[PDB]
Amino acid sequence: SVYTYFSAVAGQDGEVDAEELQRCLTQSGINGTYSPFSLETCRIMIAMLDRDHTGKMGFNAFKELWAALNAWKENFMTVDQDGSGTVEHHELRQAIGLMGYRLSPQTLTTIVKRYSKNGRIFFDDYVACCVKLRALTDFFKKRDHLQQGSADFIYDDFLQGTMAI
Amino acid sequence: SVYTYFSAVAGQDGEVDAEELQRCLTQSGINGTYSPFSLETCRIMIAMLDRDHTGKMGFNAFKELWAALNAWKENFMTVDQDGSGTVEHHELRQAIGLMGYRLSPQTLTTIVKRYSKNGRIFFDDYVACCVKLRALTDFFKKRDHLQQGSADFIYDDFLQGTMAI
Ligand SMILES: [Ca+2]
Secondary structure, three states: OHHHHHHHHHOOOEEEEEEHHHHHHHHHHHOOOOOOOOOOHHHHHHHOOOOOOOHHHHHOHHHHHHHHHHHHHHHHHHOOOOOOEEEEEHHHHEEEEEEEOOOOHHHHHHHHOOOOOOOEHHHHHHHHHHHHHHHHHHHHHHOOOOOOOOEEEEHHHHHHHHHHO | OHHHHHHHHOOOOOOOEHHHHHHHHHHHHHOOOOOOOOOHHHHHHHHHHHHOOOOEOOOOHHHHHHHHHHHHHHHHHHOOOOOEEEEOHHHHHHHHHHHHOOOHHHHHHHHHHHHOOOEEEEEHHHHHHHHHHHHHHHHOOOOOOOOOOEEEEEEHHHHHHHHHH
């Protein structure tokens, strides 16, 4: 059924832009219960997989996305002690350590304060956070040639990568 | 009358969070004929001036924002060679070079592709772009101790700064 929604909105190139992706995911039902995704979330989604640097996404990259979404949806549900579609600060920190990140308390704090609406973290923000977390790390790893946990960036390169995400 | 909108929505702390800032700017009228700001835009606004790292904004910082908004709105109008309210790729590159940035073609292209809707760039995305452009540069500058156009980042520090923006 997946291809059906993709194709339904895909362009002449068989690729979707952030706006079409949004429609596709929504018409998809993946977030059926929860808060539908925002255009900003969808833009980060594309940037996370835009290796050809076109601002669009093909069905092969979409399949990777889909895999990642259902995985993140799973974690959201398992930290969702209860139900309502919103997680708590603590519930969020636990989800992040669950995806394999080992961030410090201050950084985690920053991240949470970034996506909080009344001590709550809605589904959309939770997924935006997951996608951005990955995109940034991939960008950083590519600059950390010896994998030392540090990297040197030249201004223009630094900007191009972070503005894109 | 600036303070009136600020205080109308301001919290117990006399500070506004992203959500209240949105209400304030909107109720403010600065949006002209253009499109109203989005919550995402407002969050970058606060992050751009959040020196105390609280996720909120006081009236002193708000004054700085206001100054920058009016300035950005001026440029938007001057590149809008046809009162569309939306600018074009070229009109956008022109506004970026106008704010003092000397970015390479590829970088500029990436930036444009990030905020484009059918070859159009709405006011909200245009302001989101200007805010983010400055926030990232400020972060970079702070790590470029000798101002050489390059800087070394430790992963956790890198994430904290970019996730906040
Ligand atoms: Ca125009």
